[PDB]
Amino acid sequence: TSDLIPAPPLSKVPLQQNFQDNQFQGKWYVVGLAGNAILREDKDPQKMYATIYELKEDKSYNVTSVLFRKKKCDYWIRTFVPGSQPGEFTLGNIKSYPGLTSYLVRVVSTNYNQHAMVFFKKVSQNREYFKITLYGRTKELTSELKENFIRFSKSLGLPENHIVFPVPIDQCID
Numbered sequence: 001t002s003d004l005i006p007a008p009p010l011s012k013v014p015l016q017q018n019f020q021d022n023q024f025q026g027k028w029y030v031v032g033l034a035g036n037a038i039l040r041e042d043k044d045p046q047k048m049y050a051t052i053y054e055l056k057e058d059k060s061y062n063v064t065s066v067l068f069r070k071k072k073c074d075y076w077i078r079t080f081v082p083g084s085q086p087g088e089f090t091l092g093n094i095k096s097y098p099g100l101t102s103y104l105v106r107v108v109s110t111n112y113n114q115h116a117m118v119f120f121k122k123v124s125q126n127r128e129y130f131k132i133t134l135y136g137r138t139k140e141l142t143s144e145l146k147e148n149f150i151r152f153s154k155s156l157g158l159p160e161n162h163i164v165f166p167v168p169i170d171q172c173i174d
């Protein structure tokens with residue numbers, strides 16, 4: 001028995017116009033994180049992690065996230081395959097993940113060399129989850145980019161306690 005804020009209709013999620021797959025590659029730090037399964041937790045606050053996007057020759061992305069947990073670096077790898085329009089993707093090899101029936105990625109906005117906001121929605125064990133990441137080329141972003149991320153998250157039904165700014169760290173992600 002779970003309770004979740006509903007996924008917003010896709011019409012409320014903008015798409016980055018003219019998406020350039022080659023320029024979005026590289027490392028992105030997660031300076032902000034929001035979603036219906038994201039919960040602030042002041043006692044053990046979320047540490048910053050990073051996600052690296054590499055264009056494979058077939059134009060799919062090989063995606064690697066790295067987090068510092070239990071004194072070690074944990075790597076998670078997935079494949080994002082170009083979806084219905086430039087800037088949208090679905091998950092490769094969905095079959096290999098137990099209980100996952102849909103996964104959508106939409107790049108909301110980016111200038112490529114400093115910041116990005118990406119929307120994700122998936123259905124896992126029949127529950128509909130969504131999150132928005134505020135990506136930075138550096139671990140810090142202006143208070144202006146942060147507020148904007150907050151406004152957008154709220155615009156999708158999320159309250160403040162479902163929006164966090166992971167704390168910068170040096171382990172694993174540099």
Ligand code: CM1
Binds near residue numbers: 037038050
């Ligand atoms: C292990 C534990 C905590 C943790 O560290 N999880 C991180 C792992 C690294 C990437 C950030 N992230 O996004 Fe997870 O991805 C989501 C995608 C769409 C909507 C919601 C989520 C989501 N993930 C968090 C989550 O808690 N997932 C579950 C289920 C875990 C298995 C399914 N999930 O949930 C995955 C699967 C694989 C790694 C994805 C790699 C790429 C990129 C995205 C990014 O930049 O955040 O990501 C979980 O048990 O997580 C909360 O919402 C996490 O889950």
